[PDB]
Design an enzyme around this catalytic site. Sequence first.
Site, PDB file in Angstrom:
ATOM      1  CB  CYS A   1     -70.490  85.896  57.845  1.00  0.00           C
ATOM      2  SG  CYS A   1     -69.293  84.678  59.099  1.00  0.00           S
TER       3      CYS A   1
ATOM      4  CG  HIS B   1     -67.291  87.243  52.487  1.00  0.00           C
ATOM      5  ND1 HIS B   1     -68.458  88.042  53.282  1.00  0.00           N
ATOM      6  CD2 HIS B   1     -66.725  86.794  54.123  1.00  0.00           C
ATOM      7  CE1 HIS B   1     -68.153  87.557  54.466  1.00  0.00           C
ATOM      8  NE2 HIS B   1     -67.658  86.989  55.269  1.00  0.00           N
TER       9      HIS B   1
ATOM     10  CG  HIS C   1     -66.243  90.523  59.410  1.00  0.00           C
ATOM     11  ND1 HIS C   1     -66.992  89.784  59.726  1.00  0.00           N
ATOM     12  CD2 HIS C   1     -65.856  89.687  58.379  1.00  0.00           C
ATOM     13  CE1 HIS C   1     -67.685  88.733  59.093  1.00  0.00           C
ATOM     14  NE2 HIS C   1     -66.989  88.646  58.281  1.00  0.00           N
TER      15      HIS C   1
END
Length: 861
Positions: free
Chosen positions: A172, A303, A341
């Site tokens: 990520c 996030h 996600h």
Amino acid sequence: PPKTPNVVEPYKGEVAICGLSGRYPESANVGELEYNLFNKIDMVTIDNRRWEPGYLGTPERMGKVKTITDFDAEFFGVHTKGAQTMDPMLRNLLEVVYEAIVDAGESLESMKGTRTGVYIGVSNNEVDTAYMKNWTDDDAYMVQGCHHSMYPNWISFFFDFSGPSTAYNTACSTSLVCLDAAERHLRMGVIDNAIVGGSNFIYRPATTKLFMGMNFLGSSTCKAFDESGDGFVRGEVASAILLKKADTAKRVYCTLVGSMLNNDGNQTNGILYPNSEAQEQLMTDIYSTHKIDANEVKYFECHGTGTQAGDPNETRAICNAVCKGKKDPLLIGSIKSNLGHGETASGINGISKVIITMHSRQIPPNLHFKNPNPKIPGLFDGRLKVVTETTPFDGGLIAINSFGMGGTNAHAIFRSFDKRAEPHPASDKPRLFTYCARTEEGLQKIFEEAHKHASNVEFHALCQESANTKPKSLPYRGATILNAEGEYTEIQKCPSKAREVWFVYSGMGSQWVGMGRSLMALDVFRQSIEETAAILSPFGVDLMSLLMDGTEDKLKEIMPPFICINAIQLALTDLLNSMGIVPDGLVGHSLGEVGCAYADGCLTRREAILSAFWRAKAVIDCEVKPGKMAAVELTWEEAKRLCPPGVVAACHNSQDSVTISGGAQEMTKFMAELSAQGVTVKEVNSNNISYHSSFMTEPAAYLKKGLEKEIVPKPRSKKWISTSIPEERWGNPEAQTADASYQANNLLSSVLFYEGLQKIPSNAIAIEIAPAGLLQSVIKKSLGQDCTIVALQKRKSPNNLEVFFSALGKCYSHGVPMNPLGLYPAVQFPVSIDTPMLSSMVSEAWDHSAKWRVPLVEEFE
């Protein structure tokens, strides 16, 4: 042989995100994602698109794109063998990159050869295991289709980019790392554009089991900022963006104030534990380096993975670095709660939302936020406020975080672009919208969307900027009219080979009442007519009055016919030049040769109008005994011999039709004798004149005397095909300049229209420029069947503007470049932020007939 070094110098200007496109869960385009986000529609669903909802005990719900088995290989020049051994992620990324390039107002030809760098972010490599389980020959192409390093390079190879092409794997935060790399390369001068992007698809359920083994995944969706949050749900993304220098961008969603990266370093809580101190330090560094007031941030894309140990730390950093000194709550949010996600592509998802939040001027809501997390203090002290419903973001700065596993954090700041649209003189008058696509259905959808935005000229300009792609790339060419009284739409598949454009200028007889009256609506046409009228005024001729208030009695005389037809021809030529149509060949009938000279550049507006005026005056000033002309259906060799003394053959229209011209007595007698034998002697009015005969000896010389002092000799280009001097004398000096000698010769000598038409290719697009479509039948019979014939005007039509637009649309559909927006003032770039997105149309306008291989679950066991 020596190569000129490129000037690599630091760039101190602004960097703007121009294009955006991508495939998101339950969304085939950006428009679907925006609609779902603003309608509080959950994008994570339960089904067996990838594997059964519960296979191997994996979580049932997941975020998956609509389809990954579609790819327009022929567009990208990938043969079937290569496409089959090609990662679906790479194919989707290529399509999304093309869509984003088109969205930014750019095209294949414009982006070719530019110093653009590709910074793809991809980590998933499960396709290798799937394809190598039962590996056989012919699969070697996997090196160029499956290797991660090929994800950017292919994009660089197809679009011909000559900048650093790289693939990043930062878990990520990969998308933000690629954005930072693009900013670094942009500010140092190596590149001018960037294709920052990323993709992430799910193929292996055992990978989901592995992730669950470390407690990454929760039970329900990503309940960001919720006390019940216990994990995240995997998602799929194939999005990409285009970055450019703000001084050359044709569309600016936002401006990249700055991005920064850092690592959490060493900590006692483990490597897979977020470090609030590191994130706060990164925020402080980014907000201090650029002198950005942290209190000016309006929205904060967090996030928000929904993990218990992640959200509190991120929020603590945010309200220790950003909320310090803020006088109002900071609106925080995250797209993970909406579509799950994205893992390696997660960052891009946030960017997408930002663009949406920076385009629709509204903040999408956050889902699953029911009870604030007690561990997050800021949600009770009023410093923070999760956006649970649509909020009117007016303007300012938006900050995005993409904290990833391991500890490599990334932060970015974007500044809104406030250029609210203003009205254009157009958007209420009919306009010609021309475009190209891969499929007829896609082109029809594009036209429907354009009609939906018929009142926007910036959208039309953005579409136009990529509407001139060669047929080889986009074969389906189409044209429609927006704001049209009568519906018009043409779509046709155009061959790769480019045809030749041939302007054809008609002669006398095209006169009627109202010629060009409708075309006066266009500014260019009216300005051209006014200029011609002003030029001719000193000579006692009111072109304006004749054109508008003229009556049939006006055209009964000789002078008004010539003046009006020539003025209309010049106006049409000016319109075509303004639209940017370059004629590969030029031909004209009698009195049309002046128009060809004007369009070829050998003649000027004043010189052409005065040549026409002198032609009319030479016949209305010297006495000419009455005569006539007829349309005998004899061959040239038949007619030229059949006519008695005085009567001659004037113009060779087609393979069987010949004008005959003579004295009123000789004529009548010979025409009668003809009529006896089967021949259609259809007489034509000439004001009792016999042009292009011996009678024209006296006027022609006079004409020369009139024009010897005005027409400055100029060379005749090879494009212009003379219809008065036969080929045997083209190389002779007389056929080199269109001086008074040329005018006298063409007014005297016969018109060899058939000989000139013979030179036209067998598949040339001939545009008949004249007040009315006279020579359609003659021209069609002349060239043949494979040539396209169009007339810009129709006799006694109720709306000639629509006819002109339809003619231009057909011409474009048959493969001639043009600029329909050249008839109106140029649109100032970058366009207003209210302009819709062009990526959706291209995304839904692909050729997806074929289905390619996709990894199967059974190949992972």
